[PDB]
């Protein structure tokens, strides 16, 4: 298992210890208060309210913590996954990442929390 | 394990099928938008801006998502818990509840989707 | 989860850490050799050779592992059991017994090895 | 999860559905009667009482269940094990063997029954 900090401002992203394998099944539990720019901050799933202009996930809002595993492109993860699964083909190290637009995370501000398990299989 | 919607609106609580024993690890995930009145959602953390105005839970912010288990005081689960084991005494069945001041529920509106399961002990 | 040894030569059982509550699924392995009277010693299915002659288990042959959950009758435990869940009704302390005809137990010698840990449910 | 058959016979190994990945927990319980030539049949232990004439582990008795994890040397199972981990650097499928001297399975009998699983890393 890995637990760890995600900064919203880690425009690379947070590497974990996780390395996904065929057929594995994890769960993932974040928690805590980030901003892609705003005073205000908001929770793993985002702003509801804010447009997609440009966010490496499309699938998830700003602010909303996504994943990658090994060369996938962005999955998102919001407040966990539970029991979950990959996609047929996707597997590697988890890395996870804060969902702001490419060269826009220097004003970015908090940070998630982060619980990633290997469930039975 | 249990999965189900806990509606904001509702202030007795949504009964889970989960029965937590002595010794029990357990994992819960929620997602979901919710308000305790505003036009604006919030997730399952709530709204750290909020002020406590008398809330079932004074450790966690209005509009998270609490529990009972069995005839305890409420809980915090935000956006859920990783392995997790309670205090001692305190077993029975869990109950989601939204976070609010008692008798102010009408207005509330939307749901979490929550998972819960047992862990491995 | 428990681990322990459980004497072929005690008739009243090894009680264990376990609680078997409704709905958990637990995994048992056990190891070892024990004797029921021969010099000779059998592991934890027993003598597969030898007449039940008022076994505590008659589903198991002498010298095998069995158990107890709570005022249950005796179930073979054998070798052990992967991700297991007891019949409806069955509920209680787990409690380990070499599998003999009362009365005829202090010629016993040996003892298993066991391991019991409650999985995911 | 993998649940099959090693017949005693089978030179080769029965090979399973389980990769043992770096971090990996595994659980695995063994059942059931084989036979190394002799009429009398073991369990999954197999017979302490018959000396190493070159079996394919000498750290397992002769008619013991082992196993091959990829490229490694053979690995005792007995009856089983228990939330186990692999020494560093083994990795890859399990192939699950009968303990016997190379070139004299064609006179052996019987079969294991085996459940091998994942659990919670
Ligand atoms: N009178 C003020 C008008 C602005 C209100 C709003 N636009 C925004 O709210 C807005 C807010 C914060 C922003 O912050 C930037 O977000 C980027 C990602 O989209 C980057 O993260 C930047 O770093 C960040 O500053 C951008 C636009 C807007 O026009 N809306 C809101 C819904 C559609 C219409
Ligand atoms: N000019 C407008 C002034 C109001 C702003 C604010 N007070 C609130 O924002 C407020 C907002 C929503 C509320 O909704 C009610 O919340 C209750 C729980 O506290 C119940 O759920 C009611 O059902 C709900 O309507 C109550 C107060 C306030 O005074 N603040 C905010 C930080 C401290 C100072
Ligand atoms: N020429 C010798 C004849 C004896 C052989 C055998 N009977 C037994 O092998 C036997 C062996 C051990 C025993 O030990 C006792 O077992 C009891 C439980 O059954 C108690 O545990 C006693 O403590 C123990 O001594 C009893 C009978 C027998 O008659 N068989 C074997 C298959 C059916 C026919
Ligand atoms: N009067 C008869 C003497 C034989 C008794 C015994 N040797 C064996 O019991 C023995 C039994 C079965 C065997 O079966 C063969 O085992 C091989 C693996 O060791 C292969 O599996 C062969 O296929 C199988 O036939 C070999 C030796 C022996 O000498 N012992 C036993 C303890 C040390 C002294
Ligand atoms: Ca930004
Ligand atoms: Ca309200
Ligand atoms: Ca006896
Ligand atoms: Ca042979």
Request: with cysteine; proline share 6%.
């Amino acid at each position: 298992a890995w637990k760890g900090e995600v900064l919203a401002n880690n425009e690379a992203g947070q590497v974990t210890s996780i390395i996904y394998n065929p057929g594995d099944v994890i769960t993932i539990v974040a928690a805590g208060w980030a901003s892609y720019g705003p005073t205000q901050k908001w929770g793993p799933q985002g702003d509801r309210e804010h447009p997609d202009q440009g966010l490496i996930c499309h699938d998830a809002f700003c602010g909303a913590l996504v994943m990658k595993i090994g060369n996938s492109g962005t999955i998102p993860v919001n407040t966990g996954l539970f029991r979950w699964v990959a996609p047929n083909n996707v597997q590697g190290a988890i890395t996870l990442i804060y969902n702001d637009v490419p060269g826009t995370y220097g004003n970015n501000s908090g940070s998630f929390s982060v619980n990633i398990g290997k469930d039975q299989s």
